[model samples]
Target: AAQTNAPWGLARISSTSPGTSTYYYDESAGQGSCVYVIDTGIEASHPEFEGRAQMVKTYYYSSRDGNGHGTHCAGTVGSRTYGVAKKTQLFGVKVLDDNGSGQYSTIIAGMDFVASDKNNRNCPKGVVASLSLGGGYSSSVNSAAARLQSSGVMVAVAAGNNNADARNYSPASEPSVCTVGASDRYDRRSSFSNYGSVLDIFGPGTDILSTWIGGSTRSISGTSMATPHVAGLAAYLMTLGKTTAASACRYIADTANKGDLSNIPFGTVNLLAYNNYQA
Candidate 1:
């Protein structure tokens, strides 16, 4: 076996199949773990999310998911019937409001919530975080991510959707965070997915069908979409006893298929092998 690509086979499933149940059947099923999403608010009423999504905390630095980006990302990561971790608990932080943008301070505040609340009786162990937004990498974000990592939280970020080199945003470019890229249905890099050394892994990003506001469904594309696949996979890995971020990153990287590029970048994500490793 030439290191079976996509060891977890998450990308092999139909994105429209009502939240990630089938993918859970693969080697890295999340089995209803808890993860924090630092993005826009989830739909909260999507049928696919019934009895699955929970709002432990909400930070409205701006507004809610008026544009539907955050809700879709949430659905992909943990929608009950159609998400990667269907049974997982979701902590939605509205760093970016309806416009799909937020400042570094806002993002840092969200991280602070995750870290500080961990010790509270309401919060539990094994809390993973998924960030699907990025602009430019910054030192402040790096420091926050480092804190999260040190506190034993697994943080996964989107490796910018820009078609340029994968050198954008704070958490994604940060070494402490798991940076994810995007791939299409055929397992090829999407035209807009940023590629570079910082990318840690790739997932299905193009034409992904996920939950939207107003009880709707939509198919969108971006590295943002690819991120939750890895986030969900990390939750599954935690369920299987891979708790630490370093261990999860290593397992995913070791199992990911190396790209044809001469010198792989630091964050360049290889989806095929990660899935294989999970299997």
Candidate 2:
């Protein structure tokens, strides 16, 4: 038996093998935890959120997402219909614009907001930040992400869609983050996904179905889409007693399915993200 409504990416993470048509997840997985979507803003009123998603900060004129990227990533992290951690409190920290683009300064500012939110006492139980964006190497951006992790937020980053070494990217190359790459239903490395030893894990990114803007759903692909799966898993792991970012990252890497992906690059780890939910 499984959740008949779960998406393919959701089902892929809960089982060891591919071809599972359903998803099995802990119903209480994300309770008491918070997930910060540090990308474009989210459409907080979307039906998938069921009143759980909110925009706490924004660099743009409005908090609502016009690009649909943030809402999609947030849904994969925690939405009533398409989430990995079904009940996580979702917060949008908008750094990107409607074009899904932002500079390192804007990105770092959002991270700083997360680090200082509620006098740095937000989500004491557990906090996970999903960064489905990346750019060229930037020391300032890297340090900001590290600082966010120090503040007890598990940082999950996209390895970029450049099909090159992820070490060339800023937050993705940061040692303090859980850098995520993309995989497909067949457990194959996405042809456009960045790779390298810097990548800590892989998640289903190809043709992922999740919530979109305007109270709708859409299917998209990228390491951007893949990062939230790890973030959601990190949130779930925190509920399982892995409180710190380091602990959550370690648990996520350790618990992933090993050597299961095909077409993996030389420096990339062969592990794919899994929720380990047995039904």
Among these predictions, the greatest lDDT belongs to: 2
lDDT of candidate 1 at residue 67, scale 0 to 100: 71
Question: Please, what are the lDDT tens digits per residue for candidate 2 over residues 144-234?
Answer: 9999988868899999999999999989999988999999988999989999989999999999999999899999999999999999988
lDDT of 1 by residue, 9-54 (tens): 2535323221232442443345546777778777676787776565
Looking at model 2, report the run of 10 residues with the lowest lDDT sum: 116-125
- Model 2 spans with C-alpha error above 4 angstroms: 118-124
The C-alpha RMSD in Å for every predicted model, in order, reads 5.3, 1.4
| lDDT agreement with native, every candidate | 0.68, 0.88
User: For candidate 1, what is the TM-score?
Assistant: 0.82
Give candidate 1 misplaced runs (Cα > 4 Å).
1-29, 61-64, 121-125, 258-279
